[PDB]
């Protein structure tokens, strides 16, 4: 009946929802890191070519 | 009745066409750079010649 316990219940609920979203993404077909890593390498060599000229 | 909430309503309404803040930031940078880059350069040389 305390406000703090109500706060804690909802805190945990939100955290579970975040965890649900993380899992949902992975099940959907998590890429990201994929694209990001290729963009990083691409920008790497791009910086090298720019620096060169 | 609070200004903090008033801000939040406005802030959210904008997120209707983007506002990652990476927009304005990156943009302005190049803008200010390129402009003042030459501006100052061409002028200084040009002054001495004209005199």
């Amino acid at each position: 009946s305390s406000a703090t316990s109500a706060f804690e219940r909802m805190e945990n609920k939100v955290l579970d929802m975040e965890a649900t979203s993380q899992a949902a993404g992975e099940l959907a077909g998590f890429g990201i890191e994929n694209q990001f890593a290729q963009l990083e390498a691409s920008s790497g060599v791009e910086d090298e070519l720019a620096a060169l000229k | 009745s609070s200004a903090t909430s008033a801000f939040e309503r406005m802030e959210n309404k904008v997120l209707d066409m983007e506002a990652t803040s990476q927009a304005a930031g990156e943009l302005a940078g190049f803008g200010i750079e390129n402009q003042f880059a030459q501006l100052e350069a061409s002028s200084g040389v040009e002054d001495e010649l004209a005199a």
């Binding site: - | 200004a3 801000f7 209707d16 066409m17």
Partner: protein
């Protein structure tokens, strides 16, 4: 002496109150303007948007 220093403190609170109100008015108006900018932008997204009528 007592009434004067009491009054001085009250006067200081008055100055603080006035400053805060001034700030709130400034903030209020810029927010109305920013809200209107958002509304206008949304209507341009509509007209210069996708397909419709």
């Amino acid at each position: 002496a007592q009434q004067r220093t009491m009054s001085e403190n009250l006067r200081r609170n008055l100055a603080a109150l006035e400053a805060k109100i001034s700030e709130a008015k400034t903030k209020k108006n810029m927010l109305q303007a920013r809200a209107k900018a958002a509304k206008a932008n949304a209507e341009l997204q509509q007209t210069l948007g996708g397909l419709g009528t």
